[PDB]
């Protein structure tokens, strides 16, 4: 019944938890706050 | 706990004679209080009970799948077909006296699970034990035979009550109480107190 998908480090069963993040190479436009001098910012995280 | 976020500990155990009983002589393995129903709105608990009762009697496997066209009415009809109150109620008798109960009781099989929070693994008591080295206060942990933190909020409660002597007792005789020597001049702990 053991499904696996885990490692064995020093006899201890370890599980790598999936890490959530923002996708790269995506263009996103954001409205800045009121006290801010800039009104809009179109940014992109290049990977 | 059941299978609907209905958790709770054991209050007491009753032998089968003290337990309430149906005319069939069936005694409950478990008694829960109705007040844990309307405020939490776990209707599916009741539905599980009814379906599991019908499946128990008929000897089939009750389908409790999410989005299906299985209704309380059909289940009720099935339960009636097997010769019971369609809504799961059963006339029961008080075990102590043998006299009937006025209100009938919702009675039937329900899948309960035993959680891992048991008392003998939780229970703790300490009357003067091992202290820490840095602060000379009771150590942290039940397994290390430690004491319980008399928190800031506890202190505030004792202030609100007015029990000053108790507050002093908790903060000295109960925990770390130390005697130091002070110079009458600079007022620091410079004193080399060569006793005896």
């Amino acid at each position: 019944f053991d499904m696996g998908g885990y490692f064995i480090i020093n006899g201890s069963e370890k599980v790598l938890i999936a890490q959530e993040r923002s996708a790269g190479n995506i263009v996103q436009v954001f409205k800045k706050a009121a006290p801010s001098p800039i009104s809009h910012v179109a940014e992109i995280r290049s990977a | 706990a059941s299978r609907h976020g209905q958790k709770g500990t054991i209050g007491i155990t009753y032998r089968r004679e003290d337990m309430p009983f149906t005319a069939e002589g069936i005694v409950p393995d478990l008694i829960i209080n109705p007040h844990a129903i309307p405020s939490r709105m776990t209707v599916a608990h009741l539905i599980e009970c009814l379906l599991s009762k019908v499946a128990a009697l008929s000897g089939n496997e009750g389908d409790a799948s999410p989005f299906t066209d299985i209704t309380v009415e059909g289940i009720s009809k099935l339960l009636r077909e097997h010769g019971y109150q369609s809504r799961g109620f059963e006339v029961m008798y008080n075990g102590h006296t043998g006299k009937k109960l006025m209100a009938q009781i919702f009675f039937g099989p329900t899948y309960y699970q035993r959680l891992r929070h048991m008392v003998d693994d939780k229970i703790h008591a300490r009357a003067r034990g091992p202290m820490q080295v840095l602060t000379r206060q009771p150590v942290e942990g039940r397994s290390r035979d430690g004491g319980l933190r008399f928190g800031e909020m506890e202190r505030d409660c004792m202030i609100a009550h007015g029990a000053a002597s108790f507050l002093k007792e908790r903060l000295m005789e109960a925990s770390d109480a130390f005697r130091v020597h002070i110079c009458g001049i600079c007022g620091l702990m410079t004193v080399i107190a060569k006793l005896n």
Binding site: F1, D2 | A1, S2, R3, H4, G5, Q6, K7, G11, I12, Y14, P20, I26, V27, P28, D29, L30, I31, I32, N33, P34, I37, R40, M41, T42, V43, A44, I47, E48, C49, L51, S52, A55, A56, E61, G62, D63, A64, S65, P66, F67, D69, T71, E73, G74, M92, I105, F106, F107, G108, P109, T110, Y111, Y112, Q113, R114, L115, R116, H117
Partner: protein, 138 residues
């Protein structure tokens, strides 16, 4: 054979999914639930089965659609604290600490999703003859 597709959210943005496969066809029972008639036509994909929106822990809950959602959440939290048989080889493993139920039992009310989670083979609880009643007050 192009009968099933893999769709992520980004592509999910531009399709029209049918909830049930019976929503493609052109007096009732008051007992059942009020389901809105399909006011759409141009479908492109159809859901396999809505009950798959749940996770592994939530798929153990009987009639979760008849419950207040936070109760489903709480059960999803406490399902991971129930005892039973976690593995068949529990007697040949040397775990730090493990609890095994004396007499496990497959629930009388099950989900169709329990079939794949092997819960009917490895249950975690017992069918107790419950009674909702005010008794001794204990």
């Amino acid at each position: 054979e192009g009968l099933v597709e893999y769709i992520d959210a980004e592509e999910e943005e531009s399709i029209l999914i049918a909830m049930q496969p019976e929503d493609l066809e052109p007096d009732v029972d008051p007992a059942k639930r009020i389901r809105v008639s399909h006011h759409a036509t141009t479908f492109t994909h159809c859901e396999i089965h809505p009950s798959m929106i749940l996770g592994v822990a939530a798929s153990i809950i009987p009639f979760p659609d008849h419950n207040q959602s936070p109760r489903n959440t709480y059960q999803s939290a406490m399902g991971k604290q129930a005892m039973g048989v976690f593995l068949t080889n529990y007697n040949v493993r040397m775990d730090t600490m493990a609890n095994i139920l004396y007499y496990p039992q497959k629930p009388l009310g099950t989900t169709r999703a329990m079939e794949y989670l092997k819960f009917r083979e490895l249950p975690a609880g017992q069918n107790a003859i419950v009674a909702i009643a005010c008794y001794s007050g204990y």
